[PDB]
């Protein structure tokens with residue numbers, strides 16, 4: 001869960017969702 | 023339970039076990055068999071730190087150390103205690119974590135920080151008497167802890183060097199030093215900077231008090247003694263009734279002076295005599311010196327007994343070898359030479375392994391070959407001589423085919439076996455020596471290089487304790503010291519005011535160090551990422 | 566500037582040797598010694614030749630490597646002498662306790678370690694059966710092991726480094 005890669009991917013996904021919503 | 027000769031133990035047992043772990047540093051703890059409980063302890067933080075480090079709880083021990091004064095002394099005794107409680111660990115798995123305590127790292131990290139600013143204060147810190155740990159200096163505590171990595175620090179070496187030159191220029195050409203040493207007139211002039219008829223006497227004392235000068239003097243005197251002994255052994259040796267001479271007497275008196283100096287070095291440098299004797303046994307060089315003087319004493323008996331004229335002489339010859347080996351110790355000081363001696367000393371597997379590897383093949387080969395060549399030999403000693411000489415001589419080009427080759431007085435088998443030997447031992451010896459030498463070397467590149475520094479420190483302290491007079495002249499300094507005692511440096515510490523400022527300054531340094539460590543922790547890429555992710559998640563949930 | 570370089574100094578030593586040697590033709594009696602000086606001068610010039618090699622891409626780095634390795638001379642001269650002189654003293658003490666010549670003892674004690682390395686072992690003067698043995702064998706084994714591993718190895722670790 002704490003793989004830097006996993007953190008990055010989750011972050012990117014959330015940013016994209018926030019962007020599409022906003 | 024042994025002292026008898028909810029749990030039953032009390033603070034008395036804690037004090038006793040702390041004494042068992044550290045003799046001089048912390049013996050007095052909880053003297054006043056217990057004290058009134060109503061009384062608060064004189065210094066709490068140290069007690070809590072000890073309690074933490076005993077129960078083997080790191081991340082609390084660090085915290086207790088943080089808000090405790092006089093820290094660089096603590097974080098070293100703590101390493102001593104944990105490293106000690108390794109042979110006392112019942113379970114191996116646990117024994118590993120505590121063996122990974124690395125408390126010493128705090129000592130190094132703090133010492134570096136304080137060394138960075140105001141070094142003239144750092145040295146004062148390094149050898150100040152310690153108020154809490156039963157008034158012992160940091161260096162003694164490092165010795166007892168056997169923290170080599172601490173000695174490896176640059177500040178330690180700088181301080182050691184400052185002591186090494188007495189009161190003189192730190193750096194001075196070796197040739198300029200030799201010139202200042204050989205001719206006292208050059209001393210009066212300012213060949214090299216000198217730290218600050220009476221003026222001439224003080225300059226003379228400043229020159230002869232510096233350790234390096236005593237070192238060189240002992241060197242040259244030892245050379246002198248070795249040469250006189252060699253001359254006596256070479257030509258003076260003569261039949262016991264009419265064989266010793268005045269020169270032999272002078273040599274014997276010289277040896278008496280040497281052994282007296284060694285006893286002084288061993289015993290009068292240490293509460294009990296057994297303790298000092300153990301300290302003396304500790305080092306190897308002291309033991310070699312003991313073997314040397316024992317050999318000399320037993321050899322001296324030769325002059326007394328006519329018949330044993332030759333054997334005792336041989337003993338003396340061996341004693342010469344012994345002294346020649348003694349000479350090696352001197353080399354430790356030099357930056358280049360030392361590491362080589364460290365490397366060759368570390369490589370001690372070769373003796374055992376190779377003695378086996380050579381013997382198992384040589385003895386069997388000799389038995390088989392002597393079985394082939396001459397099946398009728400009735401002499402055990404002659405067979406011993408032959409079977410010893412053959413492998414001893416075949417390596418160095420001495421191959422007597424006049425006794426092995428029927429055409430020159432089974433051959434091809436002997437040739438095949440000798441080829442197998444000269445190949446497998448060849449590749450096997452130098453190669454193993456060398457892989458291990460590199461690795462042993464490489465091991466030495468780190469750990470034995472640290473030892474070299476360790477060895478340097480030991481030598482420095484040893485020469486500091488010596489008086490100016492040489493081995494043959496010690497007969498006056500030891501006598502004068504004994505007379506003064508019968509008639510009647512590092513240890514020195516400051517006053518309340520002066521010291522307190524130092525303590526406070528060190529405290530501030532420790533605080534700055536910790537704040538810096540925290541700041542560096544703040545900028546970890548991991549920390550930035552985590553904070554970013556948290557903020558994004560919060561923003562997402564809110565939006 | 567001229568003193569700076571080493572090769573200039575070697576050239577100076579060479580011409581000094583030649584100048585002093587040329588005096589041989591003048592003095593009849595010193596006919597041989599000056600000739601020997603000239604012989605040494607030849608060695609000097611032969612060493613001078615090495616400088617030339619610097620240009621070549623391959624050769625040069627080898628000369629650089631051998632020149633950088635100057636610890637060996639001092640360390641090994643000590644390491645050989647300390648053992649050789651003591652060994653010779655002890656062995657000559659054992660074999661012949663009555664030697665009255667300093668120069669003869671010098672010749673013997675010099676020749677023995679100089680020749681034992683290269684297969685010249687005159688047992689006719691060391692072995693009573695061929696005119697204390699086992700001690701000499703043990704010491705020679707200890708030497709031929711510790712100097713062997715110690716020399717090439719140290720040369721080589723340092724050579725690599």
Ligand SMILES: [Ca+2]
Pocket residue numbers: 287307308
């Ligand atoms: Ca000693």
Ligand SMILES: [Ca+2]
Pocket residue numbers: 572573
């Ligand atoms: Ca030129």
